[PDB]
Amino acid sequence: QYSIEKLKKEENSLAKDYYIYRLLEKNKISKKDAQDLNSHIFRYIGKIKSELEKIIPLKPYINPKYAKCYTYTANTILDANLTCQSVRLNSLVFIASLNSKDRTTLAQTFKNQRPDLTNLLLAFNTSDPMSYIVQKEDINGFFKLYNYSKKYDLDLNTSLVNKLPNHIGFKDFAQNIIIKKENPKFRHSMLEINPENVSEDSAFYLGVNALTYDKTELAYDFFKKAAQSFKSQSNKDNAIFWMWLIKNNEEDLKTLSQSSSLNIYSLYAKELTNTPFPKIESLNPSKKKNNFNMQDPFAWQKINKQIRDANASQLDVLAKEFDTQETLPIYAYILERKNNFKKHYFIMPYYDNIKDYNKTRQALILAIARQESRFIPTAISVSYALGMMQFMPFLANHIGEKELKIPNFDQDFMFKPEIAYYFGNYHLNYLESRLKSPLFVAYAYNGGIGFTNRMLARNDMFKTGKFEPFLSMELVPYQESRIYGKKVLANYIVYRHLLNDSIKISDIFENLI
Ligand SMILES: CC(=O)N[C@H]1[C@H](OCC2CCCCC2)O[C@H](CO)[C@@H](O)[C@@H]1O
């Protein structure tokens, strides 16, 4: 392990953050060491921030110009100058805390220059502030009230709902209420949004919404708008798939089957149309090694930064340098970026560690590793998940110390491919025995078996239905897990093919119900 003095000589990065966090959790950072430390942290968010702040709280930060404004309370705000009054009224909790006479007084004060404040002040003098704001069609006010409390729910007329998409908050609002199945009056109201007024993710979610109310023509129009506006080919393909499922225009399915993006929708479309499986690149570097240490986390952070900041030309230089067997994962990483994501790379590094598992199991391991890390042995996430299989430290230690009782086990063993694959196999055994489907296993790998069990216990998820199991896959309540399952499923199909153990993606979908 590295001392704080030695870590401080390394460039700021997630690897440095991780090792600082490890010192903090073992209580090895003194109050004196902690003084300058926030400048040594690459991403000052989450657990590392909570741990540091148990040693040195931050008071910060009130803009010096407005300090005096925060000396007032609800009881004294009428004594404050007008600038101070308007600053404090940015907070709806503050407004809620005022007495109603003062809300009336302030509403008058601000009616000319800040009618937004007037509307909220008067709204909070009623028993339903959302109703008052909705009657005023105050869009900024609507989103402030929603951020204040998700519990307000009301029917919204055609005029109002068509104004909501213009606000930056709309996409997260729509996603949240549709995926969580909350705010049913808002959800029902959003059936009347004109597809002309939305695009991209918003349009797509409104399609999903329309499907849940069996408004299939409205759903098609939303999905079509999404297909026309999405920036990424994978997302476009997802929208075209829905267009096809709803109306069965064979030109939509043909377009999907010819996609340059390899995803579950384009794979399924190819299978339905007897189109050949997409071309998978074959990487076999003849040079065996270079000088790069694939077990050094700091060396990876450095080369990753270079790769991500490299111009079209510099990528070609790095490609040649890492064109070795030993650095195959880095090579494929560079090529994927270098070819602007048009070629399909599905490598199988450190294969000797999995070759004795059955092919179906190999494919699942490889599918997870590809998405988790692109097979970078010293990969570290923002939550400090570790290695190719991106184990969280808690689970790594449980398996390594309690279950397998590996002598001198340290969580950093997860950076060794033999360990990552072995632990991955071990955990995948647990999950698969309970869940069976590789899609459900993927959801549980990323999101936990608890979340997955709760989702599968619901009456409305992964049961029989007109648009199942595809609709259920759009309604997986955690965005990261929803996305992850789709990507790992695609990878799984590809690796099964590469290992001469092909399965039809249609069989996967049948077994989800
Ligand atoms: C290294 C890293 O941050 N990996 C994360 C991963 O990042 C995306 C990877 C895609 C390939 C290139 C490396 C990052 O997202 C997963 C969820 O989808 C996480 O579980 C995983 O920890």
- Give kind and range of the element (H or E) at residue 41: none
> What is the residue with the minimal CA distance to atom 13 of ligand 1?
373
Q: Are 240 and 252 in contact (CB under 8 A)?
A: yes
Q: Is the CB of 249 under 6 A from ligand 1?
A: no
Distance of CA 381 from the midpoint of ligand 1 (Å): 7
Q: Report the alpha-carbon distance of residue 24 to residue 41 in Å, rounded.
A: 13
What is the chain's Cα-based Rg? 27
Pull the structure tokens for residue 487: 């990507």
The CA-atom distances, in angstroms, between 46 and each of 49, 69, 286, 441 are 5, 29, 44, 27
> What is the residue with the minimal CA distance to atom 21 of ligand 1?
372
Q: Report the alpha-carbon distance of residue 319 to residue 317 in Å, rounded.
A: 5
Q: Report the alpha-carbon distance of residue 510 to residue 513 in Å, rounded.
A: 6
Residues 6+ apart with CB under 8 A from 494: 262, 267, 280, 344, 346, 367
CA 354 to chain CA mean position, Å: 29
Distance of CA 490 from the midpoint of ligand 1 (Å): 16
Q: 264-290 burial by CB neighbour count: b if 16+ within 10 A, else e?
A: bbbbbbbbeeeeeeeeeeeeeeeeeee
Atom of ligand 1 nearest to the CA of 370: 11
Q: Which residues pair with 380 in a beta bridge?
A: 386
Q: Are 212 and 190 in contact (CB under 8 A)?
A: no
Distance of CA 51 from the midpoint of ligand 1 (Å): 24
The CA-atom distances, in angstroms, between 148 and each of 52, 91, 136 are 29, 9, 18
- Resolution, angstroms, 1 dp: 1.9
User: How many CB atoms sit inside 10 A of residue 206's CB?
Assistant: 26
User: How many CB atoms sit inside 10 A of residue 463's CB?
Assistant: 13
Q: Is the CB of 372 under 6 A from ligand 1?
A: yes
Distance of CA 447 from the midpoint of ligand 1 (Å): 13
Atom of ligand 1 nearest to the CA of 446: 20
Q: Report the alpha-carbon distance of residue 41 to residue 52 in Å, rounded.
A: 10
Q: Report the alpha-carbon distance of residue 302 to residue 10 in Å, rounded.
A: 10
Residues 6+ apart with CB under 8 A from 293: 299
Q: Report the alpha-carbon distance of residue 351 to residue 206 in Å, rounded.
A: 44
> What is the residue with the minimal CA distance to atom 19 of ligand 1?
372
- Report angle CA 442, 429, 437 to the nearest 5 degrees: 40
Distance of CA 385 from the midpoint of ligand 1 (Å): 9
Domain of 492? 351-512
Question: Solving technique for this entry?
Answer: X-ray
Q: How many residues does the chain have?
A: 513
Residue 295 DSSP class: T
Residue with tokens 């570097």: 285
Alpha-helical (H) ranges within 124-199 are 129-136, 139-148, 158-161, 170-180, 184-189
> What is the residue with the minimal CA distance to atom 5 of ligand 1?
372
Q: Report the alpha-carbon distance of residue 348 to residue 355 in Å, rounded.
A: 10
Q: Are 163 and 137 in contact (CB under 8 A)?
A: yes
> What is the residue with the minimal CA distance to atom 22 of ligand 1?
381
- Give kind and range of the element (H or E) at residue 292: none
DSSP 3-state of 380 = strand
Residue 293 DSSP class: -
Q: Is the CB of 480 under 6 A from ligand 1?
A: yes
Largest CA distance in the chain: 81
Shortest CA distance to 493 belongs to which of 352, 346, 302, 298? 346
- Give kind and range of the element (H or E) at residue 59: none
